[PDB]
Amino acid sequence: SKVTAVRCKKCRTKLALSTSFIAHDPPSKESSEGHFIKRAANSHRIIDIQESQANCSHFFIEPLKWMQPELQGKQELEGKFSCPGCSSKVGGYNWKGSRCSCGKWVIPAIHLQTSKVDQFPLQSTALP
RNA sequence: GAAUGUUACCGCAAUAGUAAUUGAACUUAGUACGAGAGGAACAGUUCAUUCGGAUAAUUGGUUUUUGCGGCUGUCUGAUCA
Ligand SMILES: [Zn+2]
Ligand SMILES: [Zn+2]
């Protein structure tokens, strides 16, 4: 396949490129990975039995040269980020959670939404 | 409405009643929250629902202004009236 590029919606600015987006094997589904576990106040009690969704509603990327000044200035645990040419939020940063939309705990990495975010091929269109 | 000197004007306020009501839209903001889907609020600005008090510039209704005009039948000889 050919290379792609992911950009923002309501604003025309290029956010990131291809050679990213690890698939990371979304389903396992034994008893607890496909279930959105909400532990209660005591006794490791699990009330909410929510099946995980089928679609992958997040993009998983690498740290970026546009992400370097935000990571360098006033570093905290979890926050939010946006576009420099706009003010529409694209997600947040974390190194201890913010699992997926499918919901597995992964290595510390930056996520990207696909709500108010779209993707386009870097080459020309197919011209139907 | 009698009576309080007569009459006239301007007032006080004891007591009694009392009335306003609810919903939207924009902005706040697709922001907060939320992994995402979704998804607010205070303040501000417009209008609306039910109720109430008044008013008649305009619009509508009403017409014994019998005000002006028209029409039928008949009577005043015709015309006019
Ligand atoms: Zn933007
Ligand atoms: Zn996934």
Curated annotation (Swiss-Prot):
<protein>
    <recommendedName>
        <fullName>Tyrosine-protein phosphatase YVH1</fullName>
    </recommendedName>
</protein>
<comment type="function">
    <text>May be directly involved in signal transduction and/or cell cycle regulation. It is necessary for maintaining growth rate or spore germination. Could show both activity toward tyrosine-protein phosphate as well as with serine-protein phosphate.</text>
</comment>
<comment type="similarity">
    <text>Belongs to the protein-tyrosine phosphatase family. Non-receptor class dual specificity subfamily.</text>
</comment>
